[PDB]
Amino acid sequence: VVITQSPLFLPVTPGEAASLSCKCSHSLQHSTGANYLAWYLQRPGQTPRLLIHLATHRASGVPDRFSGSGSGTDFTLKISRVESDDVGTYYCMQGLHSPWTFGQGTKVEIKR
Amino acid sequence: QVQLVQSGAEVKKPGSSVKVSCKASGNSFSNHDVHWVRQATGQGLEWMGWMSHEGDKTGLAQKFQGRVTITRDSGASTVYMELRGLTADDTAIYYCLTGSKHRLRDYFLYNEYGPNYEEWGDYLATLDVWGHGTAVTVSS
Amino acid sequence: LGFLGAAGSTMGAASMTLTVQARNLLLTVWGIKQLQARVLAVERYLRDQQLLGIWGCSGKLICCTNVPWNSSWSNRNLSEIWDNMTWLQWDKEISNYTQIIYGLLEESQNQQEKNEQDLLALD
Amino acid sequence: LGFLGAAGSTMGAASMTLTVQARNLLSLTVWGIKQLQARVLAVERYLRDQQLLGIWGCSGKLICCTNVPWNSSWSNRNLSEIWDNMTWLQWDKEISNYTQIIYGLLEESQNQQEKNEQDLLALD
Amino acid sequence: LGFLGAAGSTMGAASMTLTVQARNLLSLKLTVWGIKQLQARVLAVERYLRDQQLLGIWGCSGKLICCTNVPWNSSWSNRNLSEIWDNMTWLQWDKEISNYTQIIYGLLEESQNQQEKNEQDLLALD
Amino acid sequence: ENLWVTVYYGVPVWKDAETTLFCASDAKAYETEKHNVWATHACVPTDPNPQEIHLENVTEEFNMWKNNMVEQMHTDIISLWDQSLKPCVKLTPLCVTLQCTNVTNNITDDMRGELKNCSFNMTTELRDKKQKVYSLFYRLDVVQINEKEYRLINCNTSAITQACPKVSFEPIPIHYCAPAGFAILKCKDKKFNGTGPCPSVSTVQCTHGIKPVVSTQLLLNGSLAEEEVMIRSENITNNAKNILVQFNTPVQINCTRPNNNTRKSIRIGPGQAFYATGDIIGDIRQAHCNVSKATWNETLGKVVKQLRKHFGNNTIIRFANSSGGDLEVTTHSFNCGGEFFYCNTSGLFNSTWISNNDSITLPCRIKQIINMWQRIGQAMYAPPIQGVIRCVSNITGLILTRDGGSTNSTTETFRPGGGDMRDNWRSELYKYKVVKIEPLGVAPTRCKRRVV
Amino acid sequence: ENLWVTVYYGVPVWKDAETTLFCASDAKAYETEKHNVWATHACVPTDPNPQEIHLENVTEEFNMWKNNMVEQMHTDIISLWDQSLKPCVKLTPLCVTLQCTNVTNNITDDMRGELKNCSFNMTTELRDKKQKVYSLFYRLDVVQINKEYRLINCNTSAITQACPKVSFEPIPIHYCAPAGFAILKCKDKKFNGTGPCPSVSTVQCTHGIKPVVSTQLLLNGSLAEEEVMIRSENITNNAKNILVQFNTPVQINCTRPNNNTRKSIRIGPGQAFYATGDIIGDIRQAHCNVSKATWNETLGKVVKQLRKHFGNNTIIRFANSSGGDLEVTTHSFNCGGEFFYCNTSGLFNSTWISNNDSITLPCRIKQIINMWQRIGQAMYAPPIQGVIRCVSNITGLILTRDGGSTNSTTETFRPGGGDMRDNWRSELYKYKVVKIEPLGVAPTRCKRRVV
Amino acid sequence: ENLWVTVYYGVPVWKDAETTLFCASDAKAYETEKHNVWATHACVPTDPNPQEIHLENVTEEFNMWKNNMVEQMHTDIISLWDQSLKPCVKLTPLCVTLQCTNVTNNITDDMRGELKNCSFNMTTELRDKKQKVYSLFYRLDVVQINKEYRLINCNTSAITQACPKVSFEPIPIHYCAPAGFAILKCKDKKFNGTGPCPSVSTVQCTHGIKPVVSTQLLLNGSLAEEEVMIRSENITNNAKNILVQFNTPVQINCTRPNNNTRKSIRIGPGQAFYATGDIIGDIRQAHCNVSKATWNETLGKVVKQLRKHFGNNTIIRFANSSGGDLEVTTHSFNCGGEFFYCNTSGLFNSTWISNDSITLPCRIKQIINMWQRIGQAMYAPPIQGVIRCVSNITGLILTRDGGSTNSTTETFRPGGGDMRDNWRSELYKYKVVKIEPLGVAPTRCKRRVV
Ligand SMILES: *[C@@H]1O[C@H](CO)[C@@H](O[C@@H]2O[C@H](CO)[C@@H](O)[C@H](O)[C@H]2NC(C)=O)[C@H](O)[C@H]1NC(C)=O
Ligand SMILES: *[C@@H]1O[C@H](CO)[C@@H](O)[C@H](O)[C@H]1NC(C)=O
Ligand SMILES: *[C@@H]1O[C@H](CO)[C@@H](O)[C@H](O)[C@H]1NC(C)=O
Ligand SMILES: *[C@@H]1O[C@H](CO)[C@@H](O)[C@H](O)[C@H]1NC(C)=O
């Protein structure tokens, strides 16, 4: 099983909604229908943090600006009204099939 | 929050073995899955090893087979990693962390006159608070 | 001289095969049925021997009781009874008065002659 | 005319229903096991009685008056005042203990000796 | 006297313990012992019943000794009646007469019983 | 005068003994519909009119509690129950932990905390597939695992099985006949006590029909007392012995479940179908039972008048609530309609008697899983029955316990108890005994055998 | 002078009745080898000398379809079957799923899709370990889950099988009456399904009986004496099956051309599983063999007999089966320890009118057996190695008459009678059981002598 | 004047036949406790007077090695044991793998490695839960799969144990011939197994016999009357076992020197299971002691008896067995509710030429495959405490090695793994016949013409 993230990085205009994409070689759906995908944003200079888990609901304390979608193999993470404290690196994880892996990552940065 | 302690930075010769330590306050290792993650400056993230919170299941990255081992003290209050066959390219930062998993049954034969046949599947839930980490560099 | 040879003969001539007829009167599901059939035959034979002992003609293939019977049951002469009709057809003709016959033979003769035998033995 | 009707009768009056009592003397489930046991017990007891009858030579007879005298210490009643007014089992409770002695005497003292006498008579 | 006391006696002294010999002629619950006992009782009652029905067929039923009229062929045995009676036990006597038994039974029924039935039928013809 | 003892055969003889009973049913009338556990697969048909024979000049002792037919038929019914449940389905996979919530929809206020809806991890018919199954349960069958998740009561104990819903539990009037060479005696006394001779004696070859009713305090749809209310016990002095009661006149018992129950079907394995309670339609109403009150004290007045014969005629007689213990004797139970009922007889006996508008109700409880008999090595689950059930039943007796520690022969009180159904079968069969008839007999006479 | 009745005992009397029967085997010749289902490897044998006794001057009324010996023997055969199957192991665990792929290469172009290669992820004899087995399966025995497949009978009662050394081939089984009972049989050359028999005979015990299982054609039955015989409860009624019997044998041959092998499979301790191994050589469909001119002559005789009870100008037809479950659509027999299914429409494609040498039948194999009409039992046959070859006789037919046929013309028949009670009645049509009453009375000139 | 053959009834006749016998126990002595495996709950009590008479001038031929009551008896023990086992629990769930460790508690150096700590995940009162509980096992009943072990007999028939309230102690069994049959015995104390017996006598019921369970030496039954005696079907063929019967007993002690602790577990509903708990105190090997003087002098008696049928001045040797299946390899017996296995090699290191105690180790096993059958098996329940056993040895079953030369230097080894020998060593006195009370003979009888 292989996983891809796109784009590698993207310029951002502050205060404008944006989306991110992660793709994998096989469907993430479980025999019970469960999806095993969690998005993580890592600030440079510190550790990543959970944003949305299992493709359905944001983590506790996450602002409503985040939103995730997709099913099976393709999944997306859309953030509304992106601002300066959103510049960083975004990762999609793997939780359905051993070994657990992570996507290549997407970098959000303010356009300049 | 649970406090995490790791060994200090070390300088080691190539082609030798390196030992490291970790500690969690309150013996949270019993309730949280043990993990070990390396990262090099300017490159992506890679997981090396893990040890279940019960201490019953372990796994290693296939790139690290035959060079690493899983150890913990009595009561699992601490954990110790031994790293072997290290060269200059293995110089990176090594991290001790806890996590969460899913223990779910996959297959089962219900047995009328005995215990059911059962196989379990361990699936990660989330990776919990990290330690401060340890930096290991390899040089002459 | 085989078994049931008299079936082709008249009821008069059937009298010569009575001993031949009497000769053959005597955990797996097959074993269960074997036990059940053997016992069932045993109680059958004991039932018939009970009746014979109650009539007092036990141990003899033939018994000459002194009881006359109403001929209204079959108004035919014994010559044509024995020389023409088979024993089966005689039984078919006489099938229904059987229980009355059993009762009158059991009571009107046996206990009275037993009581008179006791009276004679008194003297 | 019903079964066991002689209970309300004396010994003399009980003498007409003997055959009536004798008529029904013998006439994977645990249930079936129970009926098998009942049948075999009934037949073994009936054969007990019949082999006793064969030993005593009274087989096939409801009454069998013997040549055996009895010592009078056992009962203090005489024949008329026994027969005409009293019940078979008041008599049987009176007699119930000497039954083994009746067994032994009525068998050995008479039956075997009489058989020997029949053999002697048939000898000539 | 004790059972099987006539085994040591001749055919003379054996004639007085015949009744003693005949005295014992017939005598969960899923246990194997109980099953065996049921089977054994069934076998014993069957053998006994066969014995007395055979005796009734021969017509000497109810008699511990019977006095028949059957003739026979003299080639079967080799001794006089007195020596037969005194010098030998019923056991080796049967051993001497152990092959003519079926012929003897067949004669005992067919030559006597049914013919005397015919004769008593002729008597009843009156 | 040298009389000789002479043989007689066929004389009637009575001698107490024990043999195996013979089943009997009136022409196998149960065949009209299938199927019944008590009628079983088969029993011997019988003549509708057994010949009753009343015996003149004959008196005979009849002793209760010394009879052995009672425990023989006790064994017969326990064996029948086990055999009937034998071909049915084991239910062990059903007692994994249960996730439950309180049912509060269309339920009466007093009915809260009784009906419960639970879900659990039970597989499908297929080997590798699991299904989520929910049903409505009663609290009386479930216990907490910790101080929430819940589990039923009986997976400490022996395995659990289901009653096959294709055979009914309704009782069938059963006849009994003696083996060959035996007969059954009937005491014709109208006021017969428990022990001693019976001045008027009769006999039967087969007995009347007896309903194998299971009840714990109240004799239900049995026989009536022919003249007056009847009290029996082994020894009145001994308070450890139970007190039989037999009513001269019966009053009916009405018992229904007002709730319209529904049922669903679940699969376990190959040929394994399970039945469970579905949602209930209508307002949940507690099961009740109503009986007239005026008849009730009139009957207690008769009972107390009979009671005062065996005590001081100026004491005080009071009745009360059961002393406690397990529910099977603490409350009253009955099977009406094919399912069991647990009703509070506490207020039934609330009265006190001194020297010299019409019907009352009783709340009732319902139980599915039952430890039938006193047995602890087996258990069963009653199948749910849809619709609305109804039972109409007489009352034919009471079963009582007398308090100890009484002094000066005054202030006697009584309580129900003694769940031994052997008492019920005594109170049914207590008119009959089994006796062996010996045809043999040897008596003196003037007959001397004819000379050889 | 007035006659008195007297007592007779031992007189001959037969009455209609019913009683349980016994085993009787051909001198227990099979005792040299183990094991056969029908004889339990042991029952009471018989002497070779039962003496048939003709009953001169005697006629007897017989009746089939109401005599109960057939039904008692049917329930006895069911009891023998499930008794022989009780001691041997069950097959509960195989109701798992199945991943499957088609059997390829070294195949006939006509078999494509018949055989399926499926594998298992089942556990071992040791309860904590998992393994992987594969086996060969017929297409008819398996049903798709929704490629993946599942066994057809796992939503019904469980299937049991083990224990392969036991044999299924018939042994002649006799039935001797209990004491006080005898056997009567009808001597005439031709006999209806009911009616008096002018000449009758009695025997102590019956002749050899085969319990063989046949669906649409009678096998190994005794030959008809003079001509093709037709029987039924009532010819007019169309809910009753018709009987057909042959005076002359019609020989069939059946063989399984594939060289098959068997594997040993372990699932539970003390439990041996056998499944069909990889077939050696090219796959070829099994077939049967019957002559052409013979089949013509038999059907000509059949229609000639059919002409008797109907209008002589009526047009006779036979046809394709009507459909439904395979147990009545096809023809089935177990010869060679294997159940064969195939389709007699090729043999009933014909039509008669007033006034090279063989035919081939495509035939099928089923490994799952819902024997009889039961739903609570099942069995999986053991794969038999090598090539099986069967020789057999055909002596009878069972047909049904279609509805309509208005105005007394154009009569048609189709195969039917899928109840083997018809097979056993078609065998036992000769024997009846009667009740003996040794007691009796009669008048006589005799009066009891005084004292 | 010519004779006339005439029927007689009551005639005593004997003739070889076979039926099934009557169970008989001494006055129902076992009814006091519930219940012996063999006696169960029900049989006919014995006659308080087992009357015996000597036959007057009668001799009879007996043919042992041809008796069928021995095989009937063997089948009867089989049926009784299976009947006892049937209403008990199955131990198939124990076939899961066991991890095992070598733990000793002040063990002796000759006992090291025989008892193991083994445990398994087991089941609970609920199918959802599992729990790990340890137990102790002998080295015999396990096996390494490739440490971790499994039960030795899981690749064969299932293992079944329950119902500990049954008693393993034998009781003598009488046997009575059915109606119409009889039992005949030989009085001659030097009588062979076969040949005519000059002094014969009849009995209604044969004397009570214990179902003794042993393999190498006969135990705790009847004694030879006046000297030791030896029997064999043919003294030539080596395939036949050699029976030896002693005239004087040999007292035996055997013991297990340690108390035992038992714990119970509930594998399922109604499925309580008993296992061996931890044993306190020093671990010492179970063994047996027996006087040396009786052993060697009784062996001298046996050699004196054995020299009769050879041409004397022939060397006689006994030796260590050749090995094989453990049942025939070691001396096995049950006492105190536990099965034993003993190495009788040290008892026979001596040869014989013309003209105060001994010890021996033993062994304990808990999974026993009864007789030679492999389709059934049982687990013995642990017996609490120290087992103390006293017994008499009444005989020995022997085998003769083939080969050698000049009919000299005869060697012998124990053998005969068929317990048929155990039963026949006492059944060889008795024999059954059929009685036909009817008989015929000539006479002067002419029935009175009527
Ligand atoms: C194996 O053979 C079967 C037929 O025996 C093929 O089944 C077909 O599957 C397709 C797709 O599902 C259907 O449209 C057809 O109707 C099926 N045929 C029949 C006769 O049912 C199957 O495709 C074959 N598989 C391979 C890999 O060749
Ligand atoms: C029954 O017996 C008791 C005590 O023996 C006695 O008090 C009572 O009066 C008796 N009743 C009858 C009706 O005989
Ligand atoms: C019922 O008992 C008497 C009737 O005699 C009556 O006086 C009494 O009041 C009634 N019971 C109650 C509780 O009112
Ligand atoms: C009490 O008086 C009643 C009259 O109603 C009488 O029957 C009874 O014997 C008396 N009992 C006592 C103890 O006085």
Coordinates of C-alpha atoms and ligand atoms in Angstrom, one line a residue, chain F residues 189 191-197 199 232 236 310, ligand 2:
Chain F
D189 CA -65.0 -41.3 53.4
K191 CA -64.7 -36.4 56.2
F192 CA -61.6 -38.7 56.1
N193 CA -58.7 -37.6 58.2
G194 CA -55.0 -38.1 57.2
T195 CA -54.4 -41.4 58.9
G196 CA -56.4 -44.4 60.1
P197 CA -59.1 -46.7 58.7
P199 CA -65.0 -47.2 57.1
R232 CA -54.5 -31.8 56.8
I236 CA -50.4 -30.5 64.1
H310 CA -57.5 -28.4 66.6
Ligands
LIG2 C1 -58.5 -38.6 62.4 O1 -57.4 -38.9 63.4 C2 -57.3 -37.9 64.4 C3 -56.1 -38.3 65.2 O2 -55.9 -39.7 65.2 C4 -58.5 -37.7 65.2 O3 -58.4 -36.6 66.1 C5 -59.7 -37.4 64.2 O4 -60.9 -37.3 64.9 C6 -59.8 -38.4 63.1 N1 -60.9 -38.1 62.2 C7 -61.7 -39.0 61.6 C8 -62.7 -38.4 60.7 O5 -61.6 -40.2 61.9

